[PDB]
Amino acid sequence: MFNLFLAVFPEIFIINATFILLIHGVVFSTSKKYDYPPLASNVGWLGLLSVLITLLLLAAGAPLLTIAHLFWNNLFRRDNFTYFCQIFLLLSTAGTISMCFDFFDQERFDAFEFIVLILLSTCGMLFMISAYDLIAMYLAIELQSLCFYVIAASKRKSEFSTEAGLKYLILGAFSSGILLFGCSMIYGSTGATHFDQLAKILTGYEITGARSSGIFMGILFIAVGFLFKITAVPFHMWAPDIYEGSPTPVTAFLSIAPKISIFANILRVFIYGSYGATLQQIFFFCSIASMILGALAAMAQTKVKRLLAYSSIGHVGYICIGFSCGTIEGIQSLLIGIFIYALMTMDAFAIVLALRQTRVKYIADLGALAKTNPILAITFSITMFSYAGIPPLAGFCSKFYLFFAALGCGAYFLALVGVVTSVIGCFYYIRLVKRMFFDTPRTWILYEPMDRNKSLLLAMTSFFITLFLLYPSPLFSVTHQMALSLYL
Amino acid sequence: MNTDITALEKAQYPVVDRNPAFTKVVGNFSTLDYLRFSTITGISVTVGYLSGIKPGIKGPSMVTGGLIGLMGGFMYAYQNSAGRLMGFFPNDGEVASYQKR
Amino acid sequence: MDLIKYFTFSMIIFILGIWGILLNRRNILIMLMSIELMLLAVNLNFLVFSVSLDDMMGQVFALLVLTVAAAESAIGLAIFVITFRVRGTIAVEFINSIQG
Amino acid sequence: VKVLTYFGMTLAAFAFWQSMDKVHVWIALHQDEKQERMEKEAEVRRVRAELLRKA
Amino acid sequence: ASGWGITGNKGRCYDFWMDFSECMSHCREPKDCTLLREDYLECLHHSKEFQRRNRIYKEEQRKL
Amino acid sequence: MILSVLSSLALVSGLMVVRAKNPVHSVLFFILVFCDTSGLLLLLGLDFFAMIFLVVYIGAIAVLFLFVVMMFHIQIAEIHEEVLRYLPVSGIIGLIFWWEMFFILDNESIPLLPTQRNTTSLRYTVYAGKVRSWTNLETLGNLLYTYYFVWFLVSSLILLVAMIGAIVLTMHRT
Amino acid sequence: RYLEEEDGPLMKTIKGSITGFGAGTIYGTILATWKDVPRVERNVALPGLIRTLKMMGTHGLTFAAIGGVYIGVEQLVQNFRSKRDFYNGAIGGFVAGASVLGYRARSIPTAIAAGATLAVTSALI
Amino acid sequence: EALDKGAIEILGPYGISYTFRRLAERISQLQSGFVYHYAFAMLLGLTLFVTFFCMWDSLSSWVDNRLSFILIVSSFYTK
Amino acid sequence: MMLEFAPIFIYLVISLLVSLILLGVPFLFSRFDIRFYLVSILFLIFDLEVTFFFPWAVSLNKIDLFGFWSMMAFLFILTIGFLYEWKRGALDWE
C-alpha cells in the first residue's frame, strides 16, 4: 500500500513542508520572547530549500512517478510531458522566490504567509499539470486562483493592491464559472469526464452534420476559461491592471508559473482530444488579436510594469500561433517559446526588482542608467533586444517559428500581422535602450545596487540569452520528446 | 481497496521484489542511501541556522530546517532503495543478495 | 419533457447571473452575487445530469464545487472588506485608479 | 416590491414557462422535417462532390 | 462511463460504454465502432426511441 | 406544472436578486432562490444535496453575505443607476443566449410527447435492485473517501487557503 | 469552392443593406452601453434610453449605407464590364467608404483614407 | 520638398508615426480602469464566439464574408 | 423514496397559516467590526467539515481503514488551519 504513494512523493513532501513552515512561522511570529520577529526571509529560505528538495525528488524518481498508474488513473496521469513541465514549474518557483529577499528586507514586507501561499499555489499548479479529468483540472485551477487572489491583495493598505485584488477576484470568478459551465455541458452530453473517455467518444466525428451542440458549447466555454487564464484577447484586460497593482514579486510569479501550468492543461485537454478546426480557429483569431492589441497598447505605455504586461500579452499571441497550426512542430515551438519567454521574463523582473529599491515607476526613470550603472544598462538592453527578437539572441526563435508556421500552414495575413507587430515591438523595446543610453536628463535617479541573488540570476539568464543559439540542442530535443509523449 | 503496483513503463533491471514492504525497503538502505540522507539533513540544518540568525531564532530555525531535511532525506533514500528493489534503478547489489540468499 | 425543464431552470439561473453582471455597473456586490448565481446553476446541471445519465460522477463534482463556492465567497468578501476599509466607500469611481 | 407585485410577477413567469412548454412541444414535432431536410442537403453535397471528383 | 450508479448498482449505460471501449481498443478506424458508439449515446439520451414514439403519436394525431 | 411553479418562483426571485435597490434585500431574495433550488433537488430524489444546499448556501454562505452587507450600511446613492438604457443590450444578449442555450438539449435529448394512452403500464420493474436500497448519502459516501480521495484532499487545501487569506487580509489584533 | 448560392444583384444589394443595418444596430448598442451617462441624466431613466436608441438608429443607418453601396457598386462595375476580379468591389469599397464616411466625418482626407482602407480590405478578399 | 520631405514623408515615417500613435492612444483608452468594462468585454467575447462559431449556418443566405470584414474596418472611422 | 416529504410541505403550509392568523388578529380590535466576518468564515469552514462527515459517518462500514485515514488527513489539514486561527487571535473576542 505504501509503495503506491511513490507516484506522489514530491507533492506529499512539498505539502508537508508547507505545513511545517506555516506552523513555524505562526509560532515564532507571535512570540514575545523573540520580540515578534519578521519571518518572511527565514520562511522564504526554508521554502526555497523545500522547493529544491521537491525538484530533486521529482527529477530523480522519473520512472517511479508512473508507478501504480491503474490505481491512480482516475485521479491523475503522470508521463514524460508532465515530468518535464513540473520540473520547469519548480525551477520557475525557485527563481521567483530567490528574487524576493531584498523586497522582504528593505520594504519590510514581514508576512511569511506570502511564501506559504506561493507554495500552496505551486502545489496547485503541480496538480494542474498532471490533471487528466475535468474535475481534477477545475479543482487544481481553483486552488491556484485562490492563492493568486490572496497574494495580489497582500499590500492590504494600498489602493492599488486592493483594487488589483478586487478586479482579479471578480473577473477570475466570472471566467471560472464559464469554464465550469463548459465542463457541465460536456459531462451531460457524453456522460464522461476522464480525458481518455472524452478522447474515445469525440474521435472520428468532429462536425459530421449531426453535431452535438452540447459538446460544441462545452468546448467553447472551456476554451473561454483557458483564454482568460493565458491572458488572451479579448479575455485579457484584467492582466495589465492586476500585473501593475500587485506587489512586484507577485507580478513576477504571475507572469511565468501559471502559463506553464495552463498550457500543459490546454495541450492535454484538446490536442489529446478530438474536435473540428473550430478550436484551432478560436486560438488563431485570439493570437492575431493578442499580437495587434499587445503591440499597440505597449506602444502607448509610459510605465515599465504595464509595458511588460502588454509585451507578455503579445508574446502569448505569438505562442498560441504554434498551438493553432496543429502539428508536432507546432507543439515543439510552443514549448520552446514558453521556455524562452519564461527565462527572459525572469531576467526582466530581476532587473525591475533590483530597481524597485529606488522605486522605479516610469520608463523615464531609467535616464542616464548607462552612466550610473553601465553593466546593468547593457544587461537590460540585451534583454530588450531579445524581447524584440533581434538575432542571435534567444528571443529570435519565437519570431522565426511565427513566420515559419505561417508560410507553411499557408497564411499570409498572419505573416503581414507578424511583420507589422514585430516592427512596432522593436520600436517600443528600443525606446528603453534610447532612454538609458541616448537621453541627457536634467535630473538623474541613482539606483541602489542589487543583492547577490538577483545578480547571480541576472548573470546566468544574460549568458543564456546571448548564447543559447550557439548550443541549443538539449532544449530542441527535450521539447520534441515532450511533444510526442502527448500522443504516443 | 483494490491496489495495483503495475507501472506504465516496465522496469529495465531484474525485479528483486515487485512490491517491497516498508521495513524491507528501509533495511535495504545502502551506504549511498545514508550518504544522500545525511547530506540533505545537514544542508537543511545549515540553511535553517543561517536563515534564522537575523530574526534571532537560529536554534528553532535549525530545528525546523532539520525536520524538513529529515523528511526529504528519508523520502529520497526510500525512493532509491524501493526503486532498486523493484528494478527501476540499477540494482546489481540487490540482485547479489537475491541470487545468494 | 422532464430533463428539458430542469435544464431550463438552471438556464434561467445562469442567464440571471449574466444579466446581473450586465445591469450592475455601479454595484460590485451584486456582481459578486451574480457570479454566485452562475455557480449554483452549474452545480444544479451536474446533479441533473448525474440523475439523467444514472452516473455518480456528477454528484462528487457537485460537492467539490460547493466547497469551491464557499472558499471563493469567503475570499471575495475579504477583498471587498479591505477595499471598503481603504477607501471608506464602495462606489466604483474609487476603484478605477489603475488604467491605460 | 409590494407582495402583490411579486405575485403578479410570479403569475407572469408561470405563463412564460407554459409558453416555453408549448415551444418545446413544437420543436419536438418538427424533428422529422429537420432530419429529412438534413438528408436532402447531405445528398446534394454528396452528389456535387461525386460529380466534381469525376473530373 | 464510470459505472457507479446513483442507487449503488452498475450504471444503466455502463455495458454499452464498455463494449464501445473494447471495440475502439483494437479498431484502427473509428468508423468500425460507430454502431456501438451510437448504442451508448442512445442509452444516454434515448433520442431515437423518443423520436420513433413521437412519430407514432404524430400519425395517431393525424388520423384522428 | 410543479416545475413550472418552481421555475417561475426562481425566475422572479433571481430578478429581485439582481434588481433590488437595497443589497440586503438582494441577499434575502438569494436565500429564496436557494430554497427553490432545494425543492427542485427534492424532486430529483437527491435529499442529501437538497439539505446540504440549505446547510451551506443559506446557513453559511448567505449568512456571511448578510453579515458583511448589513455592517457596510451602503447608501443608495453610491450604487444606484437607471437601468432603462440597458434594455436593448440586455435584450440582444439575452435573446442570443436564450435561443442558443435553452434549446441545447432539444436535438440531443428529444422530448417524449405525452400520448393519450397509458404508457405507464410499460414500466418494467426489477426487484433485484430493490432488495437493499442505498440512500443518496451512502452512495456518495461510498466514493468520496476511497476512489476519489485526492480530489477530497485538494478541496481541503482550498479551504485552508480560504482561512489563511481571510486572516492575512482582514485581521487587526487588539 | 463557391458553388452554393442563387445570387441576384438587386437581391444582393438589398440583403447587404439589411445585414449592414443589423450590424450597425448591434454596434451602436455596444457603443451606447460602453459610454457613461452625463451627470445631469443619472436620476432620470428615459433620456438615456432615448440616446441609446438614437445611437442604434444612426449606426444602423450608416452601416446599412456601407453594406448597400459597397455591394451595389461592386455588381454594377462587374456587370457593365462583365469581368470578375478583385478589381470590382475594390472600386465599390472605395466609393462606399469615401462617400458615406466622408459624409459622416465631414472631410475629404478622411473620405480618401476610408476609401483606401476599404479598397485594401477588399483586395485582400 | 514635394517628394522627399513631402509625399514620401506623409506616406511614410511622418504619416506612419502619427496614425500608429493615434491608434495606440485609442487602444489605451480601452483599458478604462472600470471593472464593469472588462466583464462586459468578456461577455461580449463569449457572445461573439457563440454567434460566429455556431450561428453562422443560415446567416450566409443574407450575409457575405466580404461585407463582414468591410464593416469591421469601416467601424474605425466613427465620430 | 421522497414520499415522506409531502407531509412536511403540508405542515409548513399549516404553520404559515397559524402564524398569519396569530399576527393578523390584533389588526382588528455605520460601524464595521471585522470579527463578525471572521466568525462567519470559521462557521463556514466547520459547516463544510460537518457536511463531509455525514457521508463518511454513514459509510464507515464499507470504506474501512482507507476512508478513515483519508478523512483523518482532511481533518489534519483543516486543524492546521484552525491552529493558525487560534495563534493569530481570531478566536479571542477581547
Swiss-Prot record, chain C:
**Pfam families, alphabetically?**
Oxidored_q2
Descriptive protein name:
NADH-ubiquinone oxidoreductase chain 4L
Q: Give the record's GO CC terms.
A: mitochondrial membrane; NADH dehydrogenase complex
How does the record classify its membrane topology? Multi-pass membrane protein
Quaternary structure (record): Complex I is composed of at least 49 different subunits.
* Species annotation: Arabidopsis thaliana (Mouse-ear cress)
What keywords does the record list, in alphabetical order?
Answer: Electron transport, Membrane, Mitochondrion, NAD, Respiratory chain, Translocase, Transmembrane, Transmembrane helix, Transport, Ubiquinone
Q: Does the keyword Membrane apply?
A: yes
Q: Where in the cell is it found?
A: Mitochondrion membrane
Q: What does this chain do?
A: Core subunit of the mitochondrial membrane respiratory chain NADH dehydrogenase (Complex I) that is believed to belong to the minimal assembly required for catalysis. Complex I functions in the transfer of electrons from NADH to the respiratory chain. The immediate electron acceptor for the enzyme is believed to be ubiquinone.
Per the UniProt entry, what are the Gene Ontology biological process annotations, in alphabetical order?
ATP synthesis coupled electron transport
- Domain of life of the native organism: Eukaryota
Swiss-Prot record, chain E:
Which cysteine pairs are covalently linked by disulfides here? Answer: C13-C43, C23-C33
Q: Report if keyword Secreted is assigned.
A: no
What positions carry the motif Cx9C motif 2?
33-43
Q: Where is this motif: Cx9C motif 1?
A: 13-23
Domain CHCH, by residue range, is 10-51
Classify the source by domain of life. Eukaryota
Please provide the record's keywords in A-Z order.
Disulfide bond, Electron transport, Membrane, Mitochondrion, Mitochondrion inner membrane, Respiratory chain, Transport
Record's keyword annotation contains Transmembrane: no
Q: Name one GO cellular component term.
A: cytosol
> How does it sit in the bilayer?
Peripheral membrane protein
Subcellular location(s) of the protein:
Mitochondrion; Mitochondrion inner membrane; Mitochondrion intermembrane space
Q: How does it assemble?
A: Complex I is composed of at least 49 different subunits. This is a component of the iron-sulfur (IP) fragment of the enzyme.
Q: What is known of its domains?
A: Contains two C-X9-C motifs that are predicted to form a helix-coil-helix structure, permitting the formation of intramolecular disulfide bonds.
Entry similarity comment = Belongs to the complex I NDUFS5 subunit family.
Biological role stated in the UniProt entry: Accessory subunit of the mitochondrial membrane respiratory chain NADH dehydrogenase (Complex I), that is believed not to be involved in catalysis. Complex I functions in the transfer of electrons from NADH to the respiratory chain. The immediate electron acceptor for the enzyme is believed to be ubiquinone.
Provide the protein name. Answer: NADH dehydrogenase [ubiquinone] iron-sulfur protein 5-B
Q: Which organism encodes this protein?
A: Arabidopsis thaliana
Which span of the entire protein is present here?
2 to 65 of 83
Swiss-Prot record, chain F:
Annotated TM spans: 48-68, 86-106, 150-170
Location relative to the cell: Mitochondrion membrane
Q: Does the keyword ATP-binding apply?
A: no
A GO cellular component term found in this entry reads: mitochondrial membrane
What chemistry does it catalyse, as a reaction equation?
A: a ubiquinone + NADH + 5 H(+)(in) = a ubiquinol + NAD(+) + 4 H(+)(out)
Q: Which UniProt keywords apply?
A: Electron transport, Membrane, Mitochondrion, NAD, Respiratory chain, Translocase, Transmembrane, Transmembrane helix, Transport, Ubiquinone
Please list the GO terms describing molecular function.
NADH dehydrogenase (ubiquinone) activity
Might you give the EC number(s) for this enzyme? 7.1.1.2
Which membrane topology term applies here?
Multi-pass membrane protein
Family per record: Belongs to the complex I subunit 6 family.
Q: Briefly state the protein's biological role.
A: Core subunit of the mitochondrial membrane respiratory chain NADH dehydrogenase (Complex I) that is believed to belong to the minimal assembly required for catalysis. Complex I functions in the transfer of electrons from NADH to the respiratory chain. The immediate electron acceptor for the enzyme is believed to be ubiquinone.
Q: Extra notes?
A: A stretch of 270 kb of the mitochondrial genome is duplicated within the centromere of chromosome 2 resulting in the duplication of the gene. The expression of the duplicated gene (At2g07731) is not demonstrated. It is also probably not RNA edited and therefore differs in all the positions known to be edited.
Oligomeric and partner information: Complex I is composed of at least 49 different subunits.
- Stated name of the protein: NADH-ubiquinone oxidoreductase chain 6
Source organism: Arabidopsis thaliana (Mouse-ear cress)
Full protein segment contained here: 1 to 174 of 205
Swiss-Prot record, chain G:
- Which is a GO BP term held by this UniProt record? protein insertion into mitochondrial inner membrane
Query: What does the similarity note say?
Result: Belongs to the Tim17/Tim22/Tim23 family. Plastid outer envelope porin OEP16 (TC 1.B.30) subfamily.
Positions of disulphide bridges = none
Q: Describe the outcome of a gene knockout.
A: Lethal when homozygous.
The membrane topology noted for this protein in its Swiss-Prot or TrEMBL record is: Multi-pass membrane protein
Q: Where are the transmembrane segments?
A: 18-34, 56-73, 86-103
Compartments, record wording: Plastid, Chloroplast outer membrane; Mitochondrion outer membrane; Mitochondrion inner membrane
What Gene Ontology molecular function terms does this protein carry? porin activity; protein homodimerization activity
Give the quaternary structure.
Homodimer and oligomers in membrane. Part of both the NADH-ubiquinone oxidoreductase complex I and of the TIM17:23 complex. Interacts with TIM23-2.
Location of this fragment in the whole protein: 7 to 131 of 159
Q: Which GO terms of the cellular component aspect does the record hold?
A: chloroplast; chloroplast outer membrane; cytosol; mitochondrial outer membrane; mitochondrion; plastid outer membrane; pore complex; TIM22 mitochondrial import inner membrane insertion complex
Keywords assigned:
Acetylation, Chloroplast, Ion transport, Membrane, Mitochondrion, Mitochondrion inner membrane, Mitochondrion outer membrane, Plastid, Plastid outer membrane, Porin, Transmembrane, Transmembrane beta strand, Transmembrane helix, Transport
What is this protein called in UniProt?
Outer envelope pore protein 16-3, chloroplastic/mitochondrial
Q: Which domain of life is it from?
A: Eukaryota
Region spans: Contains beta strands = 1-59
